[PDB]
Design a binder for this molecule. Structure first.
Ligand SMILES: *Cc1c(COP(=O)(O)O)cnc(C)c1O
Ligand SMILES: *Cc1c(COP(=O)(O)O)cnc(C)c1O
Ligand SMILES: [Cl-]
Ligand SMILES: [Cl-]
Ligand code: NA
Ligand code: NA
Lengths: 381, 374
């Protein structure tokens, strides 16, 4: 009846580019289709069934048996905040490992919530070393938890989580993991690696629209949380666990479309053969992108052996800014990602998450080569 | 596979989420892109601007937040009330109780002014409560209590609060878009809503409006966090025309479509009159069946009605009975979930759909009475 109301907004949001973004990312058509289904009550038997099926699929995917998996109505950073209000004493110290922009965000989340942050920082492109963590924990024995950015989206680096988590546990510390750009793209074995908190978002490796956060919490974390004073209501983890058990839903209204979308995404992974084959696909995309930029004669930021399977930070040739590549590719129909953080000018990024065909990547790379050559000639280099 | 579990199977008269317009559902499936792109910044600001217009906000700030409405309920407390500070929480239903829970769980103290389900807060009672509670920093008001179908006299209540120089926090989750709101004019300091009620958009997004006074306090408020740091959201809106973290883009697009629909129908005035017309139709419809509502005279909600079931009949029975007829109403909520069931009148629903729902409700009531020997 109000076609024009729809058409007016469509003109602003209609598909314009082939997406190689850092999040949100291109969603699979099956996911987009479920996003338009009519709503109904989140307290209904119909919804409770879907909410729980999604949680079950995530417990399987994340290999969680002893801990709890929750769906939260917020972006991933919501659980980042939750980890601090629930698992660290007021004024308590947190050893925040920083290898990029999001490690810095965790620090801000720690401090803004009344906790203290002890930093172990590296230059963009480097990954945290287990030996340095052990060293840091040695001289900072009063810290209660350690945060690890599994996949640093600003640098295209994947931290060696298993080994880092091992070291943290040897010091009997809580392990908090920001896996926003890692979950669904890099493996996570929650119980086995001894993680206490891991969180992610719907709009990265899972290829679902933004609006939902996914969290997994250990028994150890939950025991501390239920006794943690003034942790609030919106991110009261024990409250969420109680609602999941009793009402098979969330305390407040959940982002239903995104939940349906994640369920579809999990079924897609199952259809293709399971988690292993899905992660294999991600590694093949990453490889193709890295090898492709290498052919063009460009270097990447990530140190060898720690390259991200979800995104690559490419260093621009001398005299060219990341923004210039971003804008030039857009004019050719390709949306990459601007550099982020302290390397925003010396790099641009290429995401390889969500709906992405190998042929589209190849086409993107051929256009990038021309963009690079043209910018060089343009500037006389 | 998933479509089977979520496919449409009921005519919706829910308490939230609600039935969304076809236009809104269609925009919900558009492909995503960066929330840091020029394309998204344009849509984010257009939506915020249409909301500032709708809410009549000029001096304050309007924000879109990645959370359900309760998220801003929490934000109001962490940003506008000193730690250990006192808040006068007015309660007339289940959600007033939630605000109380949010106040206490965040380390603040709640002073309660509570009424039995069906009643509305009286400006005179609020005035007396405030005189006896001088240390109170803010007053919370549930504009539209969804569990009882009651609309509080916000303008008059906000008036009293300001007379005592208190901050005015308003839970308008089931009110915004269904009952008028004049932010600047009424002196409100915080008002928040969700996408899944009167606006008829899927859940996942929260809307908030904040006054200069509130922001001044928030900026100096220690340890208010990051996710609900209002001044941070204002800064990102101003500089990045987006949110600090990733926003629920589909729902933002949906709210924009919804606001354009309101415009195309004649504007806010005509939209609100449409809501009152719908509510009046439901109230007379149930009263014609021989039923009464819970809301006290003059405080009937334009978005939802709490209907008292006949003696011997539970609200749940009517809910399940209607479901078998293809109609989805709402179970009673709170301490009256047995004596009442609810009929929401939000989102997409033609007057004819309401009539068809009312006719089936009549047969359902008689069928229930008959099987119960009534
Ligand atoms: C994208 C991202 C975040 C923020 O996720 P949101 O959903 O916007 O809150 C945090 N950490 C990392 C590593 C990310 O890539
Ligand atoms: C539905 C409702 C809420 C909660 O809204 P959410 O989006 O689920 O957080 C709060 N208050 C009232 C009056 C409501 O109707
Ligand atoms: Cl609810
Ligand atoms: Cl961001
Ligand atoms: Na602009
Ligand atoms: Na602006």
């Amino acid at each position: 009846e109000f076609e024009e109301a729809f058409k007016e907004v469509y003109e602003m949001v209609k598909p314009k580019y082939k997406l190689f973004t850092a999040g949100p990312v291109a969603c699979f058509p099956e996911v987009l289709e479920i996003m338009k289904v009519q709503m109904f009550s989140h307290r209904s038997k119909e919804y409770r069934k879907v909410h729980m099926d999604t949680v079950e699929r995530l417990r399987e995917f994340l290999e969680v048996e002893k801990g709890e998996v929750l769906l939260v109505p917020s972006s991933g950073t919501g659980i980042m905040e939750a980890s601090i209000r629930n698992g660290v004493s007021k004024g308590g110290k947190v050893l925040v490992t920083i290898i990029g922009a999001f490690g810095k965000r965790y620090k801000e989340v720690v401090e803004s919530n009344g906790r203290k942050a002890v930093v172990l920082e590296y230059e963009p492109g480097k990954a945290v070393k287990p030996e340095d963590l052990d060293d840091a924990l040695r001289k900072n024995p009063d810290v209660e938890a350690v945060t690890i950015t599994y996949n640093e989206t600003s640098t295209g680096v994947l931290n060696p989580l298993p080994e880092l988590a091992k070291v943290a546990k040897e010091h009997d510390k809580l392990v908090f993991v920001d896996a926003v750009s890692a979950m669904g793209g890099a493996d996570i074995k929650f119980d086995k690696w001894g993680l206490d908190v891991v969180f992610s978002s719907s709009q990265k490796a899972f290829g679902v629209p933004p609006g939902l956060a996914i969290g997994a919490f250990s028994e150890r974390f939950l025991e501390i949380a239920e006794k943690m004073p003034e942790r609030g209501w919106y991110f009261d983890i024990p409250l969420y666990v109680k609602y999941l058990k009793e009402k098979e839903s969330t305390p407040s209204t959940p982002p239903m479309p995104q939940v349906f979308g994640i369920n579809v995404a999990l079924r897609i992974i199952e259809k293709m053969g399971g988690k292993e084959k899905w992660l294999e696909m991600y590694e093949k995309r990453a490889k193709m992108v890295r090898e492709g930029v290498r052919e063009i004669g460009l270097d990447i930021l990530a140190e060898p052996g720690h390259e991200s399977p979800t995104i690559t930070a490419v260093l621009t040739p001398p005299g060219i800014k990341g923004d210039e590549v971003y804008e030039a590719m857009r004019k050719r129909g390709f949306e990459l990602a601007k550099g982020y953080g302290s390397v925003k000018e010396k790099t641009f990024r290429i995401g390889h998450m969500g709906y992405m065909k190998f042929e589209d990547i190849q086409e993107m790379l051929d256009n990038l080569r021309e963009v690079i050559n043209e910018l060089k000639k343009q500037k006389g280099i």
